[PDB]
Write a protein that binds this ligand. Structure first.
Ligand SMILES: N[C@@H](CC(=O)O)C(=O)O
Ligand SMILES: N[C@@H](CC(=O)O)C(=O)O
Ligand SMILES: N[C@@H](CC(=O)O)C(=O)O
Ligand code: NA
Ligand code: NA
Ligand code: NA
Ligand code: NA
Ligand code: NA
Ligand code: NA
Lengths: 411, 411, 411
């Protein structure tokens, strides 16, 4: 098969090349030949992605919850946890504000079938709150229904950790083997993630080629406007979150960045925050950080605290909804700030990662990707994912080193 | 949050306090204000309970089945197992007879929506027997359908133990790893049980507060009549089961009870038969029981043979059905004696425990808690659970010490 | 219960005895007393079998996929794997040709309820290909839907093995515990297989007794015609596959068979390819095979490469379809060759085994066992399973030793 190129560029080749192949078929031989012979491969891609969502949403958050489960962390760790959380929970809100001064999508509106998308009425507040609790975890998990799966997963991991403290040894052992299996379910799903990302050049080619064949040249303006909102969201994250909470603790932010240079760029290119752990810890020592702290937080911030992804997912959600012509009620809107945090925690730190967990923040707020409108819109961001992914990863790692430095000053 | 009180009293505070708050709103401001702002919290409680049912029904009985799976028990254990079973199977039957000379519920009848509850016709005997076998374990387990889940679980655990006897070591190896995960699934669910029981003060408050707000003071008579049927069932259990099968084997029952004093009272207050194992074994030695016998049976009787719970579940089932105006056919009636035994086996030995497993003996015999009538009735018993749980636990432990004594005499 | 006889004969007693009991009730006291009092036990049997299908289809193929998962096998193994596959993929195709020059079924036509079976239209090619990918593995697995379950299972096991190669040791470990759990799920399901095969004498008795009571005697002609197609398919397999690819590599096939004597007959009688592994390796040395080769391939060919089962399954599928009056389109027909290979890989190597995986190759090609027509036909093959199983097993083992010999010559 000989297909050995570096996935990042590889995909970008799919993206640019497929874009041109889309536009030149915008005129000339009509897009209907694309939708018949090109779209299928893109659909295969999308299917393989919103395939992984449910397993990784479950196991990932049983792990993640076990990773934060109080009490199962030194008071050094409570600090870095709370920091990590409020950095994701601010970063997503920022992504909303970027989705406010920018309207990504708005002006691209589509109805696929001459049938515009319309949301089902939100049940009573009582019934939606009660509905986050599953009635039969197996059931809820089985057929979509993401939020119950979340709640159960978190509850599970947390309980598991409290099994590991038990007097009995059969009990603690059992907790170990189980949690250890759930982890590994997740990790295997991430191996699958990578495997799909090898198909990403083709799938992207087909998706953006199809989207370019239709919709004319509207999309480029919008997609670039989204990339705008995202990145200027990220650097606003850095210059307003990190640079501000660095001076408050007496850290020189400039030199901080000069030390983080290698880790930030390495994450920027590899886009595997987990694969950019050795360089992040090399940068950990290089700036005088205690062994016992950077050995604890950086491998936690590897999988937890990906606040750049939280931002990305907020922005992406507003792009989807605006592309469909829906206005996001200030209840699902804060269900974004709430959800994209947990989706950030669940995100792998791998080339694909956050886009898959986008499915999760979209199965919430009622935008199922079984609906043609949504699936079509999701495919668009998914096409330009390769672009956003790099800087997003960069901010995911910048968060880790930042938090480590702040908790390090106080201990 | 500061909420640190002892859960038992804590809950009793919720129960009494919420009762009064119910009755004073029985007059005055109509109950409709309760149902809007108070009932939601109780509903959250009930949902959290009938949530755990399916996972614990599966894993719990895979465990339990492995715990009794012949041949994986010494003939020292065969005796104590047979005893345990016939004690649960008599105790439930006794609970039915207590639900015969007492009619708990009967005279409380309700139709919630002015629509009285009515059972779907019982299919052919052939088809109901065949239906205990699931057609696709995953499916049956997933969306309710309790009995198949049981049969599969039991078959599974039993098979697992026969893997542990296999010549091969990869086989006998893996066989544990599973069983060890399934256990731990169960045990984690019990940690969750505890966690919900920390919400129990509120949920109970809301439930009996709502029930008192409507239904007037009818309920107090009935609920107390149920408590009656239960407890006099328990003491009839002791004085007719235990006291008789103690004299048949030459044990002095009076002094027996004086030794069991500490264990029975400890169980009575902690209401955690599992948490009352150290005192049960202290009382085991204190009355001259062999190390090799009381080290085997008492930690089995901790989770298995909770025949006071079996009685409770018989009575409770008749309370539910009688509260709805349904008469229990002597076909579902013996499905109670058959089921509530298995539900006793699956019960944890934890504060909540049996209250959750009622869901199981009610998804059997066809009283799903998805039907408003049933959920309303279940909420009532569920409110006064804290009361019955104590003496019930007491009988669960008294059974354990009794059986240990008899198998010890014969060995 | 005293039921201790050797299962093989035992079942044949059920088969012959029940056959006569069927025909004498063909006249005389009409079959309706059978269908009322005899059929239920057969139905119980069938339910217990198509029960195991989904768990073993999942776990079996996660294991099985891990068993072949490249790269985690030496190039010594690549050879024997490719051989194993193309032997199964030729053997099933041969079973189709045997189902062509014989028309088994055709002329037995039945509509059980005076309603002949008719297939739902096959969706677009695009949509069936996309549909092999599951949308929510949990869901697809839960309610039937075989092929998605397969695709996910294979992807999973393969990914798991790539976890076992990971730099990290927590990862490497977790992968082990998980994969190790899925194995053991499968193996336990095979213990259940055996246990059901202890009920086989009765269930078979009831099945062929019912089938003989109706349909007159024409069934005997058809069933024996199936046995014909099967066995002469097997010996055509040997004399055209094995004997030819033995001469191509300079192996003396006659003496080869004289050495394989003990293994072939032992497999023929025990019908447990897995239980006939020690004798297969005894014959491995007895004909001068390298320790490092026959210790690797023969324990793989135990569970993988059961090409006699693949043939059996092709023939059985054509028997079903022809018994219903359906002609197998050359697309589901090659879905047979594609599927029955995987079902062969998943097959246990146990007395029951392949018949259960027949459920799988029948939920593919769209012949679900929820439709009475199919279930009635499947029950027929299932009745005469005991006969085909022996020679089938024999060919399953002959394939293993053959492959071992050839790869041994080339290395
Ligand atoms: N690739 C990002 C995560 C994402 O794509 O959302 C990371 O490595 O952190
Ligand atoms: N709590 C009881 C069981 C139950 O609540 O049903 C025990 O410890 O035995
Ligand atoms: N019994 C066969 C498998 C089957 O029945 O399909 C074997 O041992 O290989
Ligand atoms: Na994450
Ligand atoms: Na991060
Ligand atoms: Na038990
Ligand atoms: Na007990
Ligand atoms: Na197989
Ligand atoms: Na074989």
């Amino acid at each position: 098969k000989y297909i050995e190129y570096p996935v990042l560029q590889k995909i970008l080749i799919g993206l640019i090349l497929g874009a041109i192949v889309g536009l030149i078929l915008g005129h000339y031989g009509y897009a209907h030949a694309v939708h018949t012979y090109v779209k299928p491969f893109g659909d295969l891609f999308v299917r393989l992605l919103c395939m992984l969502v449910m397993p990784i949403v479950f196991a990932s958050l049983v792990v993640g919850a076990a990773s934060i489960s109080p009490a199962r962390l030194g008071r050094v760790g409570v600090k870095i946890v709370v920091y990590y959380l409020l950095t994701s929970a601010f970063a997503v809100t920022l992504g909303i504000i970027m989705a406010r001064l920018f309207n990504p999508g708005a002006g691209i509106h589509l109805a696929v079938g001459g049938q515009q998308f319309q949301p089902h009425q939100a049940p009573p507040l009582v019934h939606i709150l009660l509905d986050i609790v599953p009635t039969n975890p197996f059931g809820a998990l089985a057929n979509g229904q993401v939020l119950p799966t979340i709640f159960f997963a978190i509850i599970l991991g947390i309980a598991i950790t409290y099994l590991m403290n038990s007097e009995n040894e059969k009990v603690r052992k059992s907790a170990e083997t189980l949690l250890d299996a759930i982890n590994g379910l997740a990790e295997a799903m991430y191996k699958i993630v990578n495997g799909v990302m090898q198909y990403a050049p083709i799938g992207v080619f087909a998706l953006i080629a199809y989207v370019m064949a239709e919709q004319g040249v509207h999309v480029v303006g919008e997609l670039a406007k989204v990339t705008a909102a995202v990145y200027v969201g990220l650097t606003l994250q850095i210059l307003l979150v990190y640079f501000v909470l660095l001076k408050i603790y007496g850290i020189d932010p400039i030199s901080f960045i000069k030390h983080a240079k290698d880790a930030m760029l390495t994450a920027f290119v590899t886009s595997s925050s987990s694969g950019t752990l050795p360089v992040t810890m090399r940068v950990a020592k290089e700036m005088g950080i205690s062994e016992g702290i950077y050995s604890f937080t950086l491998p936690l911030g590897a999988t937890i605290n990906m606040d750049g992804t939280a931002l990305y997912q907020g922005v992406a959600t507003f792009f989807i909804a605006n592309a469909l012509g829906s206005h996001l009620t200030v209840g699902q809107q804060l269900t974004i700030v709430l959800t994209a945090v947990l989706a950030s925690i669940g995100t792998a730190g791998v080339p694909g990662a956050g886009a898959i967990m986008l499915c999760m923040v979209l199965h919430s707020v009622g935008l199922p990707l079984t609906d043609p409108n949504v699936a079509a819109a999701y495919a668009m961001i998914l096409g330009i994912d390769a672009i956003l992914d790099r800087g997003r990863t960069m901010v995911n790692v910048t968060g880790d080193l930042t938090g480590t430095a702040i908790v390090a000053k106080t201990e």
